[PDB]
């Protein structure tokens, strides 16, 4: 399903560790699939995300909110990737046609490892029209 895409391609372990939680979410707000411990994702939050891709940097004041949790905005890519820093851990959000790929990492996992996994899947879904 969309679960296979979350279980195999996002929550798969690189070296030792893996992401804390991950999800593929319609730009509408509709979960396509999530991992066991991905937070319910307030509607106010999904908006803030979607409209930061349309007009880059819109989110910067309030910052990336995912399931109540505040993440400071790191360098993203303009209209493609949004990145979030919360102490050692963080989050990456990669935009598709229809959807968002979201990964959330905690140390000892790196931003790099999170970026790899989230953006790679993203670019696949884009290739496929999603």
Curated annotation (Swiss-Prot):
GO-annotated molecular function: actin monomer binding
Primary localisation category: cytoplasm
Record-linked CDD domains: PROF
InterPro entries: PFN, PFN_euk, PFN_sf, Profilin_CS
Keyword tags: Actin-binding, Allergen, Cytoplasm, Cytoskeleton
Keyword Iron-sulfur recorded: no
Annotated localization: Cytoplasm, Cytoskeleton
Domain of life: Eukaryota
Keyword Membrane applies: no
A Pfam match: Profilin
GO CC annotations, alphabetized: cell cortex; cytoskeleton
Signal sequence coordinates: none
Assembly with partners or alone: Occurs in many kinds of cells as a complex with monomeric actin in a 1:1 ratio.
Role: Binds to actin and affects the structure of the cytoskeleton. At high concentrations, profilin prevents the polymerization of actin, whereas it enhances it at low concentrations. By binding to PIP2, it inhibits the formation of IP3 and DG.
Annotated family: Belongs to the profilin family.
PANTHER family: PROFILIN, PROFILIN-1
Protein name listed in UniProt: Profilin
Species this protein is from: Cucumis melo
């Amino acid at each position: 399903s969309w679960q296979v895409y979350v279980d195999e391609h996002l929550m798969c372990e690189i070296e030792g560790n893996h992401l804390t939680s991950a999800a593929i979410i319609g730009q509408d707000g509709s979960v396509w699939a999530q991992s066991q411990n991905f937070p319910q994702l307030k509607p106010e939050e999904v908006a803030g995300i979607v409209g930061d891709f349309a007009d880059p940097g819109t989110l910067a004041p309030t910052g990336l909110y995912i399931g109540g949790t505040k993440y400071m905005v790191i360098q993203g890519e303009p209209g493609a990737v949004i990145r979030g820093k919360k102490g050692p851990g963080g989050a990456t959000v990669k935009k598709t046609g229809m959807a968002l790929v979201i990964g959330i990492y905690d140390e000892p996992m790196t931003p790099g490892q999170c970026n790899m996994i989230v953006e790679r899947l993203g670019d696949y879904l884009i290739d496929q029209g999603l």
